[PDB]
Design a protein around this ligand. Structure first.
Ligand SMILES: FCc1nnc(N2CCN(c3ncnc4sc(CC(F)(F)F)cc34)CC2)s1
Length: 465
């Protein structure tokens, strides 16, 4: 069960009391993932899922939390017999990790909506027998820690989760599902996905969590949403405070998305005497560059979205061009659909809306407009260049004529006299993709040749008779 020293802060009567509990666990050799997730899922359930009776904060009584902890630990200890899986050198075996994964999986409800909110925590596992995809992975890691398997840790990409374990922490194992329909490699390594250079496995530049970073994950996993138009202020505040705690302790150093999430919160409600959201976005980017070979897409997408929301068009374009410059060195593979959808929405909805507004504000006398800045046109072109390069040597195609219509529209937003100022070298820009190299003369012409652009972008061979 819980240690006497873990129980002394109960009952938890406020956000700050939950923060104190996290501070205490984080000061321990090994923070207790099961305890912490149970507390978070409890407080989340009574602040976002069922607010009936709420007066300030759902009090977390020790008797309630200890009973939940006991249900978890007994379920796992009862189902996983460790004597059957001998441990050399303080390291777990692939069979043991698979067993734990099987226990978690076989405990879940046969049928449910697998991307509902609030199914991420151990509280949900225990009270609802429901977990989302990365919730299963986290639950495997928490179950492993509860079994004393110190080597089993959470591994995270930008769209998937699995575990690492074994000698030197060098082994990988699939423990959960990914996406929709995708058919199990449960129990297998991730080395095939790494070898194929898909975004989903980050060319091996994925996060290998220590226990502190596992705490950070569960804090990022808090979901303040009450419905589509309403967030829990209490849960926002709790997540923000918990992320600052982690930050001050050093545990967001290797966690770009967490710094992004904290920047996003700070934009919504800034904490006096903290770094601005911009600074936090840039620390996320710096983290990706330092620890992950600058192979992450979301650090730039978080920046871009901030600049977008604030109508810093130039800086939004730049950051989306940087997103593309990351993606260009990946192969577009089957299970990377989420990042395709994001690039599709930026190219075909967000950019067009932004430039449409720019064009009206131009007509209204704007000065320093993105549409009169050749550097902005260059960013636009680099964005497409990365997408085209990504497409090169991918099994499936990325671009198609639906992209071409928006590209022509977006180019058309910039006058000839602006477009002709970008210097495309073999503002200065170098193209990496063959599509954009062959488009160069079309791009800087007075009248945009729409049909020729479409053929170049889509590699459509012929025009109709
Ligand atoms: F583009 C700007 C973004 N805004 N929100 C973004 N995300 C929301 C928060 N996200 C995350 N934030 C912290 N950690 C993780 S780990 C992970 C992969 C998973 F779910 F485990 F399989 C996702 C994710 C995912 C990306 S990106």
């Amino acid at each position: 069960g819980l240690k006497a020293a873990q129980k002394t802060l109960f009952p938890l009567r406020s956000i700050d009391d939950v923060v104190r509990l996290f501070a205490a666990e984080l000061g321990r050799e090994e923070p207790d993932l099961v305890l912490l997730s149970l507390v978070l899922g409890f407080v989340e359930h009574f602040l976002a899922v069922n607010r009936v009776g709420l007066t300030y904060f759902p009090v977390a009584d020790l008797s309630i939390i200890a009973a939940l902890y006991a249900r978890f630990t007994a379920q796992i200890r009862g189902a996983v017999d460790l004597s059957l899986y001998p441990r050399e050198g303080g390291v777990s075996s692939r069979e043991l990790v698979k067993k734990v994964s099987d226990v978690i999986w076989n405990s879940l409800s046969r049928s449910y909506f697998k991307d509902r909110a609030h199914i991420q925590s151990l509280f949900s596992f225990i009270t609802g027998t429901k977990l989302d995809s990365s919730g299963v992975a986290f639950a495997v890691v928490g179950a492993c820690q509860a079994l004393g398997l110190r080597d089993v840790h959470l591994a995270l990409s930008e769209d998937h989760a699995w575990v690492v374990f074994g000698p030197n922490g060098e082994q990988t194992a699939e423990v959960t599902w990914h996406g929709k329909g995708n058919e199990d490699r449960r129990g297998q390594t991730v080395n095939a996905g790494v070898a194929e250079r898909s975004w989903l496995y980050l060319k091996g530049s994925y996060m290998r969590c220590d226990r502190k970073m596992e705490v950070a994950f569960m804090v990022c996993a808090i979901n303040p949403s009450i419905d589509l138009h309403t967030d829990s202020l209490e849960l926002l505040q709790l997540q923000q405070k918990l992320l600052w705690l982690l930050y001050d302790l050093g545990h967001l150093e290797r966690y770009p998305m967490a710094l992004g999430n904290l920047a996003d919160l700070e934009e919504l409600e800034p904490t006096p005497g903290r770094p601005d959201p911009l600074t936090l976005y840039h620390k996320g980017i710096a983290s990706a560059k330092t620890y992950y070979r600058d192979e992450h897409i979301y650090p730039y997408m978080y920046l871009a979205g901030y600049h977008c929301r604030n109508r810093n068009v130039r800086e939004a374009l730049q950051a989306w061009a940087d997103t593309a410059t990351v993606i260009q060195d990946y192969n577009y593979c089957r299970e990377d659909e989420e990042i395709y959808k994001e690039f599709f929405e930026v190219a075909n909805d967000v950019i067009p809306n932004l430039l449409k507004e720019a064009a009206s504000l131009l007509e209204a006398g704007s000065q320093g407009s993105a549409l009169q800045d050749p550097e902005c046109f260059a960013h636009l072109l680099r964005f497409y260049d990365g997408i085209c390069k990504w497409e090169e040597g991918s099994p499936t195609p990325v671009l198609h004529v639906g992209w071409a219509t928006f590209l022509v529209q977006s180019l058309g937003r910039f006058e000839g006299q602006v477009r002709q100022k970008v210097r495309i070298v073999s503002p200065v820009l170098t193209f990496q993709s063959e599509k954009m190299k062959g488009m160069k003369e079309l791009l800087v012409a007075t009248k945009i040749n729409s049909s020729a652009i479409k053929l170049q972008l889509t590699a459509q061979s012929q025009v109709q008779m």
